[PDB]
Amino acid sequence: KQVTDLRSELLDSRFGAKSISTIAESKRFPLHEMRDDVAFQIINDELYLDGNARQNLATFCQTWDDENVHKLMDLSINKNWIDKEEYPQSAAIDLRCVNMVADLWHAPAPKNGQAVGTNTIGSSEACMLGGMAMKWRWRKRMEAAGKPTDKPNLVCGPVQICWHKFARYWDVELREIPMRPGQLFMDPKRMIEACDENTIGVVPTFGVTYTGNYEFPQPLHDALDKFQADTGIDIDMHIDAASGGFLAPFVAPDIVWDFRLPRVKSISASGHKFGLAPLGCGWVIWRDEEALPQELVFNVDYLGGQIGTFAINFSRPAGQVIAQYYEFLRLGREGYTKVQNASYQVAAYLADEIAKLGPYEFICTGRPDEGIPAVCFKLKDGEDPGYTLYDLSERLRLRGWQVPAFTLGGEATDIVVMRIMCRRGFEMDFAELLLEDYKASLKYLSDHPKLQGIAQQNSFKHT
Amino acid sequence: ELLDSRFGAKSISTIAESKRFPLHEMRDDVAFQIINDELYLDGNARQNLATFCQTWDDENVHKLMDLSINKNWIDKEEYPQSAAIDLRCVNMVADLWHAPAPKNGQAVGTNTIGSSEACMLGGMAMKWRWRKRMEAAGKPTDKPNLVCGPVQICWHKFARYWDVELREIPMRPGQLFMDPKRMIEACDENTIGVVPTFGVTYTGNYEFPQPLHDALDKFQADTGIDIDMHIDAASGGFLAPFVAPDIVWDFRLPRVKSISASGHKFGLAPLGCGWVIWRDEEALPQELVFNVDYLGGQIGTFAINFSRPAGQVIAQYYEFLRLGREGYTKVQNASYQVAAYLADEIAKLGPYEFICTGRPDEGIPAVCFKLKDGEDPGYTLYDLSERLRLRGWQVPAFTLGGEATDIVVMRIMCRRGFEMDFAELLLEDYKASLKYLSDHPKLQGIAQQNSFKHT
Amino acid sequence: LLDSRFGAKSISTIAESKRFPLHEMRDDVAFQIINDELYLDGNARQNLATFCQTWDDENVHKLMDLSINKNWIDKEEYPQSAAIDLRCVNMVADLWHAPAPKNGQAVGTNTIGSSEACMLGGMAMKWRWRKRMEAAGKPTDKPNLVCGPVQICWHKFARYWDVELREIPMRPGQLFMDPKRMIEACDENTIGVVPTFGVTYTGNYEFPQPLHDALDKFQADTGIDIDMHIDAASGGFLAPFVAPDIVWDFRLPRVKSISASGHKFGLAPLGCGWVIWRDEEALPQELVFNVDYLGGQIGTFAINFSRPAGQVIAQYYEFLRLGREGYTKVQNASYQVAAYLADEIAKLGPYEFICTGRPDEGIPAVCFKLKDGEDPGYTLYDLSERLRLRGWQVPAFTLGGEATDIVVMRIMCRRGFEMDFAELLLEDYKASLKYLSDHPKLQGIAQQNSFKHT
Amino acid sequence: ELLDSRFGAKSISTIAESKRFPLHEMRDDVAFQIINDELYLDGNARQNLATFCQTWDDENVHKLMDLSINKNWIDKEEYPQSAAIDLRCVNMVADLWHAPAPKNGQAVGTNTIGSSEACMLGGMAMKWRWRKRMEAAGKPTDKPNLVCGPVQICWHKFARYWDVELREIPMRPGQLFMDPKRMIEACDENTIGVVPTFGVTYTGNYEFPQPLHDALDKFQADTGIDIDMHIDAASGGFLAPFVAPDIVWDFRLPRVKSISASGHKFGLAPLGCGWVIWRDEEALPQELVFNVDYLGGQIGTFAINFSRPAGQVIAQYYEFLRLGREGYTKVQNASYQVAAYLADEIAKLGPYEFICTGRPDEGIPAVCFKLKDGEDPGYTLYDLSERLRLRGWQVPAFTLGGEATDIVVMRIMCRRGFEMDFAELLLEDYKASLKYLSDHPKLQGIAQQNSFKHT
């Protein structure tokens, strides 16, 4: 016997109306119009299922929010970076940024008053551009010397994925010096071993994604000088400064990593990492006009003359440049120094406190002179404290944190590391919470020994 | 000693320093106002009739973009819903373009920042399919070529960056596009693909893939050489499927192995959104896809970029959901009505030859025209373009490439926002500009700089 | 020492967190410091344990924001807030079929939640019982309250007001207050019976009518005349809409008062509850307090005093924008989600259902246990843990009383938790099952009860 | 048919079927504007000088309140940070009030919705401590009394709702408060506690717990009866510790076992915030605390409410953080300067006798006065209160209680936002009021309704 009052169609409890599903028929282009504010609410509501990344300590990307950055981005939604005619002031702001970054990295003073360089969407585009230019300089040099150009290689260390894509996409052989116990990085000796007359260049990673440590270009530079004296082979560098390029110039200026080194022919870095810009910002600088083959530059006509671009992308919003510029303007060397120090302070504290808790061997402990604000550690060989770092990572996820555990590469294919990144916003008070969560996780694992060895999926390690 | 009248305080100049990294902090709200105030020197684009890119404003799109400022498109793990939404978009564009039903339920393809990246990906996929096919037949792979018409700059860049001989069929008077005969004359065993432009940038006319397709079938029958296509649908890819569905241009054509389009042109997305779809898994050589590790397994990506914000995807979604076929159809036809109306009206005002008149069966909502050969009305289209700027319009005048190198066209793009009432206003300023050039004959022949033509 | 957000000396909230701060700090830094730590709260969008409203409506944010300073108690300075509040009382009374008031105004009040509403109802019960014993010459020193598996607010009532709580225990095969066990616990000292019209722990209705029948028979057999307060915290904004023929409210002569939470299925934002009395006779006037103001005087029955009026105002917003028509659609949608989930979940493991999201039986909740003697190689605690890793809070906990060995999972379907979100839960549930099967060493590890109380 | 001029559509009255749950839906935005339009009829309280509750507006507070509309104070599990903030406030309020350092690191206390809930909790705890001891002695426990002065209505409610006999020492001419002598008269073995009011509602004056404390010591000396105190510091609790640190009224007195205060009065929090602190675990009977399971363990609450929003606590913390003792001292001094100034100027205008004059060592920022006995300046304070209403001011006149049922007083409350300039405007309006009453003598004696005195 009935007591209910029902309806015979699927309803939505937000809209008190027939249900609209993003999930059914999400495989065809929708047939009908729907009310705008309804489509908006539907999407806005699903977006709550994303993280906010505040407790994500795997990423390098910016995740703090400044209102002024919000407003600048919001005014710039239609400002086309590529369209100098319609947006001359965005163009001008972009050119300042290029000089500013050039200046920070010690680029030789231009003849014409403009540095050779370009904004990009990220390090990835910036690397291709650097890579391509490498390839082209090398092709010209070999052709001048009547030599075949069909077997180019590129020597590097535990590079970021962008170099694996460049090598693959541009038919360059990647001579990646493998990680091994006792030297996770591209040392002078193994570098020279991998070098020959087909080497388009060497790419040291100034802040290695996997661990946090700098590859130092100066000792590599010396080896390349000795290499030229010994063989006649003249090899240059591109520095992948994704992270370190907005760190060292502020907290460790004495590290000679940049255009101070003559062989350094170009540098890339990620504005949306330690540059402090919002997602979608990268930089690449060349030493001078000679470092950038004019064959790669496209000249387009516009009303005020014609402008030269070297870009993989074309039309795109100018807001990230505009916010980048904001960060440069509001902070300067003075403010960047303070802001990066804070992050280093955080990393260093975490390193010294985590050391107390477990049998750990450290690869990176957030020291300005060795790398980025990152903490990287593994278990001491032959030590079993009653979990793996995988298990501990999982425990930390149930407290809201994402602290990646993953394996190294090459000959260190069975070392499992934990990496913690300290970006803007993850302040001291948030690090104390992490610490408390870490201790509570250890107790839990100690009290629940059956949890050992169960977890074994690598967390996302790439950015 | 210099003061600023805004801040009632010592002057801070963006031009002083501007070449050195600044030394000192400054107050955040001052830096903000400084930059904001300088941004007023940019145009609004509302009156810029050169561009193809979205320049209208919708509060909801502003809201979604702002929500999304930190949403990392690559980071599937942290932003799984952004990821799920992207994947819906890939399926909806595939279906729009009649892609074959996928065995595993997910269409093959990707979001990109623009047509430019989407062209690079399509290009690379062409080059790899041809390479693999030739390697498997024991043949040299060092002389690849690409056959195309009056292509967008991305193809020139692709060719140079990836060492492919660009075989571009030149524009010539009468025939400002890639016709089958000249297409075939350029084709061979080293041809990695043909690239028709479904919406030629310079004119607004569609290159029709079908007759070209038939010519490739005959070419295969005659020589054994089996050449595929990638359609550059930067603009037409979000037009024809709504206002001219019977134009057979997309994955209905077997040889079409991939297609690209700009979500930030007629797809109605904000700047920073392009798409590329492949026919099926075979059309996309796995060697180009990179599999990263994350906690739910691994995802493969084919991208030139890496981290970037997910907002444009999310906005494009909003457009797809709020409009659907029915809404897109009304939205695109309204722009066609604008363009057709301007073609008609402009025609009455001087001695013009039309190349493109906003007809939906021929191209995109553009009006493209030149002065009738010989007829000298008392100005060039440069002059007219300068007059129009003084009244706030950007209506570009430029020369065609190739063998059409004497030809000076004016191109007007009709994009969302540029309604019937604004077209009327342009018409009024057009007339007033003509009146002035008549009253001031000395102006004739003075202006001679091409305006930006590429997007 | 340094802070990266402010590029300045660090100010820590955690350092001197125990003393009153000594010095001023810039207001906007103090704001950003707090705003940043609030990101560590959940948003609850994936929390399926709570009944409370967690969806967002721009109009409600505006009404609350306008109302931050409007004092609910000060009828004189906020007469319009007071008027709106009086309409609410009338409308809730009307929904629950209260006798038309002789004056024009129903006997009822807004509260902060069901907790306060309950205390008020229980106090009135206690007073009514006391008056009836005094007029009969009997002692009043050992009052008891007969109930089933009530919400904590009734244990709080019983303790704070010195009433013996005769809670009928949940048992296997009989989870609720049934008439027989209800009567076995009744006597001349029973101040009343409290059915729970939407049991917190499971989602099921305790049906007042059958209990009402037994209380009639009990008066017939013994002379002892016992009344009811219905705790309709959740059910009070469900049944009148999707199950109007369940006879649970003032249609039953013994139901002397009813309470509900506006901030559960009333759809109001946090900090809104309601209690209504049948008529003036049901509310002892000695409990009502008259305050003097310029327009005369009003009476309130409240444990709180000054507090903001926005919740009431937002509640009224929902009443006006929805009506019966709107509510019926809104609650219907929640039930459809719950029933779907129940059916789908039943296909994925060997489960026994206690609640399946059917509007004739209860609230939009799913509640289940593993079948007796059946071992799929995980416990509901385990599954709940895997679920937390995909972002959901799907609580598992034990039932009380003689059902204390019994572990259940309870899924609450509230506004915003729509069909698409439910499909995603289901994908996540499957994925969790699979992972549990691939990792059988996980079985039995997790053993902490999730928060079950609201 | 009936129309609405706002919507240009058929009229929707909120008054028509206002006694029935509405039948039908209406547009959301119309329902909002309808409600928003009615709310304009509420006062804004800025000219209301009767209330103690926050009426000023701070954007930062609005922003935190709006972020927190859904944060559940009781749900420590889902909102663990709101919880942490709450606990900090408890320790900070405990410290301010000199609570002995916690043996475990956490003070005994809780946020409440207001002083009201806080008084019940305090009242209950006194009841139980008293009960335990009398039950140890096998003594009857069915007649507990509570000894106090001119308490706020919450003590009347506590008394009634918990069957405690309220021994309120009446106000009488020259002694308007609880003194040691009359307090002691009312104490016996049934007294659960004494509640001094540290900021009397009706007058603003402090009841000083120290001389009362001495008397209780003597009482225990003389009779063996050991009586504790609960301080109702609704208003005083956030005034004295900053501007009169030397008044000993808090946990510095051994007998003070708990204290309550309103955050939303001089604590500066928005509406819906109170605090109660206990001296230590012993002052709070465990039987009153409820332990509730959750993931990270379990927490105990002593609360009358359960689910409710965390925003006011968050806002409270905001004020504690941005102000500190330094900032609070300035804020409260400011209010005192205004009260004192008004007392001084007002005494110049008529034959008044002041009960309170905004001295920080005597009471709260309030001015309280009556007409000098047997003096007739040609109006009653009721008459004056009416003239001031016509100028937008609510300045309540009401009769005192007990033996001063005869005295009519005017009381002015000076809270944050009522700055020196507004005090000047009230005075201007006060003088305008005296002038008019003078020019129209027939007004004398007409008005006779007490204004709301309670909060």
UniProtKB/Swiss-Prot annotation, chain A:
Q: Name the EC number(s).
A: 4.1.1.15
Q: Where does substrate bind?
A: T59, N80
Q: Name one GO cellular component term.
A: membrane
Keywords noted in UniProt: Acetylation, Cytoplasm, Decarboxylase, Lyase, Membrane, Pyridoxal phosphate
> Single GO molecular-function term?
glutamate decarboxylase activity
Which positions bind pyridoxal 5'-phosphate? Answer: S123, S124, T209, H272
Q: What's the short name of a Pfam family annotated to this entry?
A: Pyridoxal_deC
N6-(pyridoxal phosphate)lysine sites (modified residues): K273
- Chief location bin: cytoplasm
Relate the outcome reported for changing K273A: Strongly reduces pyridoxal phosphate binding and increases stability of the polypeptide
Q: Which reaction does it catalyse?
A: L-glutamate + H(+) = 4-aminobutanoate + CO2
Say which domain of life the source belongs to. Bacteria
At what positions is N6-acetyllysine found? K443, K450, K461
Q: Name one GO biological process term.
A: glutamate catabolic process
Q: Which cofactors does it use?
A: pyridoxal 5'-phosphate
What's the family?
Answer: Belongs to the group II decarboxylase family.
Additional information: Changing Lys-273 to Ala increases thermal stability and protease resistance. The unfolding temperature is increased by 11 degrees Celsius.
NCBIfam families named among the record's database cross-references: Glu-decarb-GAD (TIGR01788)
Q: How does it assemble?
A: Homohexamer composed of three dimers.
Record function comment: Converts glutamate to gamma-aminobutyrate (GABA), consuming one intracellular proton in the reaction. The gad system helps to maintain a near-neutral intracellular pH when cells are exposed to extremely acidic conditions. The ability to survive transit through the acidic conditions of the stomach is essential for successful colonization of the mammalian host by commensal and pathogenic bacteria.
The protein's name:
Glutamate decarboxylase beta
Gene that encodes it: gadB
Curated annotation (Swiss-Prot), chains B, D:
Which BP terms does GO give this entry? glutamate catabolic process; intracellular pH elevation
Residues at which substrate binds: T51, N72
Write down the EC number: 4.1.1.15
Establish whether keyword Membrane is in the entry. Answer: yes
| Database matches in Pfam families | Pyridoxal_deC
What InterPro entries does this protein's entry cite? Glutamate_decarboxylase (IPR010107), PyrdxlP-dep_de-COase (IPR002129), PyrdxlP-dep_Trfase (IPR015424), PyrdxlP-dep_Trfase_major (IPR015421), Pyridoxal-P_BS (IPR021115)
Where N6-acetyllysine occurs, the residues are K435, K442, K453
Q: Does the keyword Acetylation apply?
A: yes
Chain residues that bind pyridoxal 5'-phosphate: S115, S116, T201, H264
Q: Which GO terms describe its molecular function?
A: glutamate decarboxylase activity; pyridoxal phosphate binding
Keywords per UniProt: Acetylation, Cytoplasm, Decarboxylase, Lyase, Membrane, Pyridoxal phosphate
User: Which branch of life, at top level?
Assistant: Bacteria
Swiss-Prot/TrEMBL catalytic activity: L-glutamate + H(+) = 4-aminobutanoate + CO2
Q: What GO cellular-component annotations does this UniProt entry give?
A: cytosol; membrane
Reported induction = By acidic conditions. Expression is regulated by a complex system involving RpoS, cAMP, CRP, EvgAS, H-NS, GadE, GadW and GadX. The level of involvement for each regulator varies depending upon the growth phase and the medium.
Q: What does this protein do?
A: Converts glutamate to gamma-aminobutyrate (GABA), consuming one intracellular proton in the reaction. The gad system helps to maintain a near-neutral intracellular pH when cells are exposed to extremely acidic conditions. The ability to survive transit through the acidic conditions of the stomach is essential for successful colonization of the mammalian host by commensal and pathogenic bacteria.
The record's similarity note reads: Belongs to the group II decarboxylase family.
Q: How does it assemble?
A: Homohexamer composed of three dimers.
**Alphabetized PANTHER family for the sequence:** GLUTAMATE DECARBOXYLASE (PTHR43321:SF3)
Q: What is this protein called?
A: Glutamate decarboxylase beta
Q: Which organism is it from?
A: Escherichia coli (strain K12)
